[PDB]
A paper describes a structure:
Two loops, comprising residues 79 to 105 and 138 to 163, extend from the GBLD and wrap around the Cd. The C-term domain, residues 592 to 876 aa, with a central β-sandwich module follows. Additional calcium and magnesium ions were modelled in the RgGH98–BgAtri complex and RgGH98 apo crystal structures.
Fragmentation of this species showed that the deoxy-hexose was linked to the hexose at the reducing end, as determined by the characteristic fragments at 431 and 449 Da.
Author numbering: 48 to 893
Write the structure that this text describes.
Amino acid sequence: KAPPLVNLAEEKDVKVTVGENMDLKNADLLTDGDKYYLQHDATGNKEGNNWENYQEQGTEVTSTAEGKNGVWVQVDLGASYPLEVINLKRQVYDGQATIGNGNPSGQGKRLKGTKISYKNTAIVIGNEEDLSDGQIVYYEGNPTLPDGVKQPENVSKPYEEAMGGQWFYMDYANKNGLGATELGTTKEARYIRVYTENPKGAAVKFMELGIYGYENEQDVQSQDGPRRVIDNEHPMMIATAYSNDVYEIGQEEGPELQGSNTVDGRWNAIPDDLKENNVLLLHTNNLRQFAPDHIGQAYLQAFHEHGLQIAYEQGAPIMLLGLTAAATPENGGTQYNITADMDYGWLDLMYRMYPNMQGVFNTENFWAGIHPPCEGSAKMLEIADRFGGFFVWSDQDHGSTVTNIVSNANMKKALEKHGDAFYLIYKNTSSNQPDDLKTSSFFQGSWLAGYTGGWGMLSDTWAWDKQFSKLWQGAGSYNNWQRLCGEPEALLGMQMMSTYLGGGVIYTFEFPEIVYGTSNTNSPANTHVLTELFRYIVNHPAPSKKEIMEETKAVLYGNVSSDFYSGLSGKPTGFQIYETGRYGIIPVIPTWGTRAEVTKKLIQEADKLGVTPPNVLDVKDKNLSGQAKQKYFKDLYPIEYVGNAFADKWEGTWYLYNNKVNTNEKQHAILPLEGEEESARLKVEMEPHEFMIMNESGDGTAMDITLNNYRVNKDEIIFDNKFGLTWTGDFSPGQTTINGKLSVYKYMDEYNVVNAPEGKLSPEDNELRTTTFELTKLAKEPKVQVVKGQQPDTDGQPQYTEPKVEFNEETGKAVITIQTNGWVDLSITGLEFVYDENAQKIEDEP
Ligand SMILES: [Ca+2]
Ligand SMILES: [Mg+2]
Ligand SMILES: [Mg+2]
Ligand SMILES: [Mg+2]
């Protein structure tokens, strides 16, 4: 299936001509779709241990006219087509480029040599073969134009030839044809002529003339609003499609992903009803890592083009990894990733070509550099918003991440004009640094003041590696690939719940092969936790900006202390969860401007939402000290419930979890219930790795409860290593993936499989844990039933027991007990609450 914008120069049966006193050699090379001319694609673009050299091939046009070196080449498309983009590449280097040292020194490789700056370059298009009706796309120097074509008033200056060529668009008033246009800005032409003079000789090597357009005017596109909405009513889950680091340009099959996954495979594993709230993130991973300019650019473009094309045929919306490890074409950039060889003209083209192209993703740049990734991000945010796309920046903030983003003049300007398309999500990879809660505060704060379009989460099972191993145990001396597998599945649900209640709208998980799955199947975590809770979040919109602003009495400004949250919402664990919902996330506005500037911005946002502005406090305010903060916040936000469990009430629904990450302790929540009887109480008691959603009928007679405590036991299969998997960071001979990764894949493929067929193992999820509910004070026994519950795997073992009800006629206390490992939907009916003079008081301690 063809996308609407095509390279007509490649797709059509074109005729190539030159002018009088010119020789034309190898005319086919101009429109063969090849800008790089690589020879060793079959051996990782290496001869032995060395990267193949850059050897430039191209259509040669040579002047045979005495004293006149200027040449031209014309393409006849065979009919008149709406044209939108032209890509010209000529020979880049005067002689042969050599492979030399890049960044970092001794790993990164960069081409070295003298680059050519061509002169008397012009592009003319028209519908007459002699171009007597010619229109100028580009004009530099003083080449003689066709009879009937006037010189422009505005003339371009020479540029240095580049690995990706030059990009031209159809508005001469927009940087003299170099300025990117709105989608569907076209001019009709059959004939395209390129003038060039080589500064040294009478011969120009034309490596590629790409001519991008439509079959007809009916196909010409328009950007009519955003490609997708991201907000409380339109949440988005991102799943990362990592290259397995194996690819050959021209291969028939799709790009192979980690864990025998494919782009079409991952898309087709998503339930149909959630496809409108999902995107796939194409990530180059370590594909051709450290390669010089020609190999890096060729593989960056081929990998993403192939992914985009498969996604286009399947109807999958796509994000591209724009930048990690400061690997950007900008000055000071590294070659840690082939994103170093990004061409902004190509990125623009992918938006024009692929209607399913939506987003650009940035993560983990600042460890390797500050300003280069800010310069790259500024341009890519501008490109995204031009095409109604979006940009996601994922990082943990120690106190200077957002400060550094906004300190870049170009990024600041880009955020002022395009900030509504820009989203900040946390990343708890470094769980050992207690920066999880302040990161959420910074990102919610940025959105609430109106600097960004939203905030969200990336939960990483690498968080487990930094602290824990077996259930209830510390890290020990296990291999880090073992500890990556150790995180409780329900804990991912608790994090989702916490993001949701803070008006988060983006949900992302790593490691992808554990949290989403392998071999184009769904993991236990995905099937029994992520998919179910994300469906809830799609059908029950999160708090809007209006709803969060309404409930916020105080916003902080500046670099909030990591431990500010201890004695308030909870001690930072590195796992993005809370001890209570009483205070929400607590928005902290980073250094987007002075305190006075962010204040104006926040109060003007509140005014737009039609709500009372919050008070702004500097983090250094005397009321926010260790001694004063509890009294200040307790007076602002009334207590909603009593107990050491997490609980929040949002739009009539209760949300709870046990907030212990890896210590085996029960917690309880005591909730005041709706209805005529104000003394009515529910007490919930939960063991760790459990979340719960409760909705009262309102008339006081009934209550629906969904709980989910799904957890696979890894103690024997992963940590004891019962099947003798090789857990190392090393490659085995002839393998292209390290043993640690292979063992994770094999674990997910053989030993931890949902509906495990013959010869594979059901997940180790059959040990049930007790939840107890106490309802007081009642006149008679209530009725409890399981409306729906999690069904057994192929081993036939139950994931829940029938609930047991005990009613004491003397006290009027109903105790309801159930054992689960997974989810159940309970319906409690026949509730008749009477006055309880002993009802737990919903108040703070004296
Ligand atoms: Ca070519
Ligand atoms: Mg605004
Ligand atoms: Mg209700
Ligand atoms: Mg089971």
